[PDB]
Symmetry: D2
């Protein structure tokens, strides 16, 4: 497999390449970055190689500037971690608009070379996955983002821990914006197959305190850290493994929806999809509950607003 | 960890010891059998050792006759595969009664040495797990059997395959007798967390044709095979891994129930339980549907009948 | 990958298919056998499927009689476990001659369909790998056998255990006949890279007692066992993994040698080779010691004798 | 197992904690750092937890300032990555002396709390492992460093790649200073067990060009990178796994030697040792070649010089 990472120099970009180089399926890992951060990549390539010293690996790592993405052709998927590390004076709209030009820039540049899967990690993930789709001019099945996938795993752990059951016995998810307006679906949450609602202990699940932490895990940023390292990479790797192996998992990624959920059209948002060797092979439409769909409505509304301000940058 | 297998000479006993010797947690594997089949075990020990040649392992394999189970003390769990390979003239009651004396025999002999977990594999698994419990005089949390666990995985595969979703995205189970009266619970079956009922395609799930095959997988026996080899061993290993690692999974094993499910008392049957380092740490009681509990009632009735005929052998 | 096993019904054949079905690289596993043992295979297929219940696998298992090997075309490798379970009255020459017709039979039948790698397991492994090569009319790089590979791992364990070092820190091997005339090469035996000879404790290595056990591990047969189950399968799986993944390992398999070792020509014997995606890609010729080559000479002599008696059957 | 990392905030410290938290054997991971970098650790703890989201783990992560190492008691091993990131004006002696006070500081502080294994990563690794030993006042078996272990793996890859053999078929090592004076031992280098010298292609092994790169991999630092990230962490994890599992591997770590190699006394240097549950359980003394021991003599001389300047800081 051939994966390309755009922004392999950043924390997540680095962590992600590391994990991807260890994969048996990784044949050509292309680390792309701007002309001035090319030494940091070659520095990364040498570092990764050390971490692989002793284990079998045919991972060919390549480094290039974001000028001639020619080498990125035939990539099974192209990840994008590029983006401005936010900033004090920066506002949500201010942040949206900025990375928009960065993701779009790459989206377009990529699109010229070929048709590949664009896995958008940079924030606002939804608004950015939207942008990449618009500027890439790709099919809705080729562009998706990390969305609420990690928030979902984060919600899964909390619950499994609350009930004292093996992590695997739980399956839940958060749909909507990968932000304050994210919607947790307890209607699609089972404990060992059994709807969480069929358990007494459920009535005592600190759902609000829990969502609060999930929602605000942007505390990696504030908590003396750049913003995120391994958390994301770990998720990304999973999603890539899902694609290359055509796993057909029912993840919750930021994908383009259009009616699958009544009242939600023309917007990239965190929704359940079936991921396989062809990207977002389906936007699973299941009946939510009264308030879940009301809340899922408001979330998309928020996101759409930004999508407009960005659609033409 | 110290596991003992009673019947390590049979197909399943052999396959199971093989898999268990490869486990990092296996410290002392005791293979027990009758005086005349001791050469087959030492023959097994040497064989397993070959399969381990090249891989790290501190698995001490021991062989002994079923006369002085002294060596089986301090075992974390004792598996029992011993039993008559059924027979043409043999009837269900005829078969029940026979293995009953075999499992009970061991149950009692084991009980004398110490208090351990007794994992009963021999059939009728439910009726035999019941017997082992009665003759072992152990706590309901220390005696359980394979029950409908493999039938559950078997049902899981079929479904995941019917919907074309990753095996992991499905969680379902069959409660009741590990036989013709087994009950599939589609009320505790989720696809990616979503109740299977919330999918249109569900309406077309060949639930009857499917259960038929699961139910009658006693075709290993008839289909030019002794009766089962790896299928079971693979399951057993999982369940053991679940215990040693205190996984806290919500499996469906043959355990002693008593009211957890209204209308079901004094019987060992396939029911959902929370398995950990202390065996059946809980018999999860969830509200079934109208017919699931009606059918679960009839199953237990059947099983109980046999339990009586065996209670004092 | 597409592997075919000829004799999937035997102990090793069964164990091997089990292990191979679990491999991520196994796409189509063809289990071939005679018309009367077709139910035992379908019985095996169903059993294996149970052991896979719960884990991802795209392993398509197929069953067919040894009449129309048409289905075995495009197989990356074809394993052969078919053979007479030896017998009391049977003599080495008697045994050689018999399986010769069986392996040759299949060799020829396979050859007609296509050009594939023939991995010969049945004994006498050397004499049988020779035969399969002769009757298959394949290139010396496409036909090889288990030879002294397991005897080598067996020797490795013994040593590592004698020095009290991690299994991985040892690399040794036995060349020659997979029989009484096998030759252990302590000249190609390192402990952590260091020639075993550079260790004082070496002087006390029970090399003779050790080789005796290795040599006579045909005690699985006598020790109340058919003859071997998992030991072999475990090895086979490794060797197949080596091929499919073009590992380029320096194993010790029964391959066709012709001068690589001075004084050893026109014979299939246990010798060091470089295994990859193209089979025996090289018969590594390293200078042995005075007696190692003298002993390696006698071994080949023995084997050759049988090869003649079989060359035209 | 309880591991403590001193400097969990640095690149290697972070990467290492990540890898260690994923280990099944990791029960309590203590991340220690100075009062001002405590938010970076809690930020790390939250990040790691995200990378673990979905996988089983009982890894309790703890964060504390380097004031009251009370919590670090009962640690199976304490890793030390603390140290000054070198500097332009800084000279080898200047660098040695500085980190000396840092490692020694911690060494002493640790020693007060209890007797544990001190795994010294900070440079100069040899001179620093020496210091930690001196200020910890521990037994020579409890203090060791990364030394030439990664340089050894680095040499292993290069070779295996030069011969086109599976990575596992090679075992070589570099003894001496983890610096310009490092000594490669081709006398303890086997290819598939066979002394590398017994291969013709060996005569063409670019041993000098190769060692040059290994030696100067301090190019991570210069090549737009802090200095090293995953390379080290990957190694460290291995060495820890080696300890917790009492693997008994013959690694090449920076340990205290005293005569094991004639002409080498009172110095911590990269030498072959047997690592197990008790640390450096033996300093393997094998006869080197004429020049290997001459070169190994000069290396130790260099290192000793620094050890003096540091012995009392
Ligand atoms: N999903 C989550 O939970 C989560 C959490 C935190 C952060 N994030 C997002 O994921 C990314 C993580 O960032 P990080 O830790 O990797 O490091 P960083 O320093 O925030 O970002 C480094 C990356 O941004 C690129 N970049 C910076 N300025 C640029 C510009 N003007 N034009 C184009 N590219 C530019 C860099 O490329 P060059 O080297 O070529 O400049 C590099 O690829 C961000 O986009 C962030 O918004 C997601
Ligand atoms: N859950 C499932 O899906 C499933 C499927 C098939 C079978 N099974 C059950 O699992 C077991 C599988 O049998 P198998 O393939 O391992 O081989 P087998 O030949 O059916 O059984 C061999 C075992 O039975 C013991 N045994 C035979 N006669 C005995 C006697 N009179 N007293 C005490 N022990 C006796 C043997 O012990 P000695 O060597 O000491 O005689 C050995 O441990 C059976 O009990 C069977 O009912 C379960
Ligand atoms: N490396 C070692 O140390 C070691 C040790 C022991 C054994 N082994 C090897 O491992 C294998 C063990 O044998 P096993 O457990 O597989 O069972 P087995 O009973 O020895 O062999 C069964 C196989 O032989 C076939 N067969 C028997 N008679 C035949 C005939 N007249 N014509 C054609 N095919 C015939 C069977 O086909 P049907 O079912 O169609 O009849 C079946 O495929 C052997 O091949 C042996 O060489 C290796
Ligand atoms: N084997 C190889 O080839 C190789 C190559 C390169 C590097 N490495 C090693 O790997 C490590 C890389 O360093 P890094 O990424 O961890 O980050 P770094 O910036 O080099 O070191 C950070 C650590 O040093 C501590 N520290 C800094 N100044 C200190 C002082 N004055 N007193 C006490 N502690 C002080 C920090 O504590 P606070 O955060 O509390 O200040 C933190 O724990 C080094 O130890 C180096 O020796 C090995």
């Amino acid at each position: 497999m051939k994966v390309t990472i755009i922004g392999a120099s950043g924390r997540v970009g680095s962590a992600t390449a590391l994990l991807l180089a260890k994969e048996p399926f990784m044949k050509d890992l292309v680390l792309i970055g701007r002309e001035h951060s090319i030494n940091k990549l070659e520095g990364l390539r040498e570092d990764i190689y050390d971490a692989l010293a002793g284990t079998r690996s045919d991972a060919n790592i390549y480094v290039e500037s974001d000028e001639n993405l020619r080498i990125i052709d035939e990539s099974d998927v192209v990840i994008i971690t590029s983006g401005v590390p936010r900033k004090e004076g920066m506002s949500r709209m201010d942040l949206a608009k900025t990375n928009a030009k960065i993701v779009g820039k790459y989206a377009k540049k990529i699109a010229e070379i070929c048709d590949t899967k664009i896995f958008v990690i940079t924030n606002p993930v939804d608004v950015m996955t939207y942008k990449a789709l618009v500027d890439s001019k790709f099919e809705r099945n080729q562009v998706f983002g990390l969305g609420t996938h990690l928030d979902s795993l984060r919600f899964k752990v909390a619950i499994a821990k609350f009930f004292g059951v093996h992590i695997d016995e739980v399956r839940t998810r958060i749909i909507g914006e990968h932000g304050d307006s994210m919607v947790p679906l307890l209607s699609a949450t089972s404990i060992g197959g059994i709807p969480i609602q069929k358990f007494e202990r459920f009535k005592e699940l600190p759902i609000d305190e829990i969502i609060e932490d999930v929602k605000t895990k942007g505390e990696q940023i504030i908590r003396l850290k750049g913003g995120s390292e391994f958390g994301p990479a770990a998720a990304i790797l999973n999603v890539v493994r899902c694609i290359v192996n055509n796993e057909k998992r029912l993840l919750t990624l930021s994908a383009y929806v259009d009616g699958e959920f009544d009242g939600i059209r023309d917007v990239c948002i965190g929704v359940p999809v079936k991921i396989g060797r062809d990207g977002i092979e389906e936007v699973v439409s299941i009946e939510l509950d009264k308030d879940e769909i009301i809340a899922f409505r408001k979330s998309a509304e928020i996101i759409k607003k930004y999508c407009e301000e960005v659609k033409n940058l």
